[PDB]
């Protein structure tokens, strides 16, 4: 809170934090796509996709 | 350099030059393009009994040599003599195509020949991957249409073929109005045409063949993936030119611009071909060769290639098709000029080899379609007259944003989808 209750300190730091975290989410999305890339997508049959890929 | 063709009751065509031997043969205006899906391989079978041990020994006693060739538009049966025996070749032709054309089809001869074209066509499919691929190219490019039938026939139409199928075909296509008798070597026109008008007897004159439905190009692909083969072999083409197209020579020249290549021949790596700068850096292939195949109704313009670089097939295809894009937009004077000179050289080496059996096949096929042969010197006049503007107008019609046909076998996992290949038939512009 930065004090006794939810007040000015609170809302000013919550804006600053609201601006920051979207960029951390962006970095986590890149890490998400990195792990996706080494194994590729799955498919609705649940079996290997290796025998028939298209770009 | 001669072209003497005159029609008596039959049509007789000759081209004589003092060489050594003489070749005589009949060339019929019907080939594998005239067969069905179901009697496919009947012409190849005809060829193979004509060269059977029985018929071939009867010719070798007389000192005669036998040769035959099955194509798409036509078909040829040829005997080579030693040039004074130009009469004893015509004896063997008629003793076969009137007398023995009921004795060649004996039960034991047919079964031993059918067994030999079966081991023959099977061996082809098992091992000859470049021609196998090129044959399947015609198959998909011209599907459900006369040009799609392979010349050797298929294993399944072959093993179900009987003596009556040979007969029915021979009775519909080995006619007089579908024939030309051809003589090459050194023998005169009047030396042969008199030995022909010596004996009369027409045999089935007045009978026409059977008409059909016209050949058409369909953009498509057949992919014969086989991961156990050590290479990938691919062929790729657009609809090219029929013989007796105005652009017959423009097409052939365009193919010479990109030419053919062999990575292991030092000289080949040095040719004046811009594509070679791209493909040699990572060695994108062992070989390629461009072609302009022309038939009666249609043709194929494209290239074939073989490669062990199985993870970069997409760069092979991409660089090759970017080069072809250039023909519409940026091909240079000196590329055209280089192609003229090399087209002449190769067209020369074809039309004037020291082998009359090739001369007969080239003469025969030509006169069957246009009723005459264009002389080598007449071709050079046409070749020299081609401008950059001609090639561009041709490519803009045949190459630019046009459908393609693809075939391949071996390790072709890296050959991308159709639409990716097809998108490269042009470029983005403002
Ligand atoms: C901002 C959030 C996210 C982004 C931009 C994102 C993006 C992607 C992309 C582009 C794919 C491939 C295409 C697809 O399958 O839809 C993917 C796959 C996948 N994602 Fe996400 N993702 C996000 C959040 C999540 C969350 C919240 C979960 C699970 C708790 C998740 C689980 C997965 C899984 C398991 C796959 C693989 C699916 C498969 O191939 O069967 N993702 N994601």
Curated annotation (Swiss-Prot), chain B:
InterPro entries found in the cross-reference section: Metalloenz_LuxS/M16, MPP/UQCRC_Complex, Pept_M16_N, Peptidase_M16_C
Pfam families: Peptidase_M16 (PF00675), Peptidase_M16_C (PF05193)
GO cellular component: mitochondrial inner membrane; mitochondrion; respiratory chain complex III
GO biological process, one term: cellular respiration
Chief location: mitochondrion
Membrane topology: Peripheral membrane protein
SUPFAM superfamilies: LuxS/MPP-like metallohydrolase
Record's subcellular location: Mitochondrion inner membrane
Disulfide pattern: none
An MF annotation (GO) of this entry: metalloendopeptidase activity
UniProt entry keywords in alphabetical sequence: Electron transport, Membrane, Mitochondrion, Mitochondrion inner membrane, Respiratory chain, Transit peptide, Transport
Subunit details: Component of the ubiquinol-cytochrome c oxidoreductase (cytochrome b-c1 complex, complex III, CIII), a multisubunit enzyme composed of 10 subunits. The complex is composed of 3 respiratory subunits cytochrome b (COB), cytochrome c1 (CYT1) and Rieske protein (RIP1), 2 core protein subunits COR1 and QCR2, and 5 low-molecular weight protein subunits QCR6, QCR7, QCR8, QCR9 and QCR10.
Other known facts: Present with 19300 molecules/cell in log phase SD medium.
Function: Component of the ubiquinol-cytochrome c oxidoreductase, a multisubunit transmembrane complex that is part of the mitochondrial electron transport chain which drives oxidative phosphorylation.
UniProt similarity note: Belongs to the peptidase M16 family. UQCRC1/QCR1 subfamily.
Name recorded for this polypeptide: Cytochrome b-c1 complex subunit 1, mitochondrial
Organism name: Saccharomyces cerevisiae (strain ATCC 204508 / S288c)
Gene: COR1
């Amino acid at each position: 809170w930065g004090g006794f209750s939810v007040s000015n300190p609170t809302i000013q730091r919550f804006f600053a934090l609201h601006y920051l975290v979207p960029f951390i989410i962006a970095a986590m999305v890149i890490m998400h796509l990195m792990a996706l890339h080494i194994h590729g997508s799955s498919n609705p049959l649940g079996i290997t996709g290796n025998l028939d890929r298209i770009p | 350099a001669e072209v003497t063709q005159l029609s008596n009751g039959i049509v007789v065509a000759t081209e004589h030059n003092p060489a050594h031997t003489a070749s005589v043969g009949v060339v019929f205006g019907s080939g594998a393009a005239n067969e069905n899906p179901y009697n496919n391989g009947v012409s190849n079978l005809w060829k193979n009994i004509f060269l059977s041990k029985e018929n071939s020994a009867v010719a070798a006693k007389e000192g005669l040599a036998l040769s035959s060739n099955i194509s798409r538009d036509f078909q040829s049966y040829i005997v080579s003599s030693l040039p004074g025996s130009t009469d004893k070749s015509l004896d063997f032709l008629n003793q076969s195509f009137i007398q023995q054309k009921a004795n060649l089809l004996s039960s034991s001869n047919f079964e031993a020949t059918k067994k030999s074209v079966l081991k023959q066509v099977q061996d082809f499919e098992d091992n000859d991957h470049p021609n196998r691929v090129l044959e399947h190219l015609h198959s998909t490019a011209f599907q459900n249409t006369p040009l799609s039938l392979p010349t050797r026939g298929t294993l399944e139409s072959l093993e179900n073929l009987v003596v009556a199928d040979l007969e029915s075909f021979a009775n519909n296509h080995f006619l007089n109005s579908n024939a030309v008798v051809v003589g090459t070597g050194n023998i005169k026109h009047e030396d042969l045409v008199n030995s022909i008008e010596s004996k009369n007897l027409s045999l089935q004159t007045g009978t026409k063949p059977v008409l059909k439905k016209k050949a058409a190009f369909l953009g498509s692909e057949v992919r014969l993936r086989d991961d156990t083969l050590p290479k990938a072999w691919i062929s790729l083409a657009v609809e090219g030119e029929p013989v007796n197209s105005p652009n017959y020579f423009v097409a052939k020249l365009a193919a010479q611009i990109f030419g053919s290549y062999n990575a292991f021949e030092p000289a080949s790596r040095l040719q004046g071909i811009k594509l070679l700068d791209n493909i040699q850096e990572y060695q994108l292939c062992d070989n390629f060769n461009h072609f302009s195949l022309s038939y009666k109704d249609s043709g194929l313009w494209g290239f074939s290639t073989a490669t062990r670089n199985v993870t970069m097939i997409d760069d092979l295809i991409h660089f090759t098709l970017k080069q072809w894009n250039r023909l519409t937009i940026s091909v240079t004077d000196t590329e055209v000029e280089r192609a003229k000179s090399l087209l002449k050289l190769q067209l020369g080496q074809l039309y004037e080899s020291g082998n009359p059996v090739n001369d007969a096949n080239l003469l025969g096929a030509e006169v069957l379609i246009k009723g005459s042969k264009l002389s080598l010197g007449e071709a050079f006049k046409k070749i020299d007259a081609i401008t950059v503007k001609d090639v561009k107008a041709w490519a803009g019609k045949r190459l630019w944003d046009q459908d393609i046909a693809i075939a391949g076998t071996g390790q072709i996992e890296g050959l991308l989808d159709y639409m990716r290949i097809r998108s490269d038939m042009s470029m983005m512009r403002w």
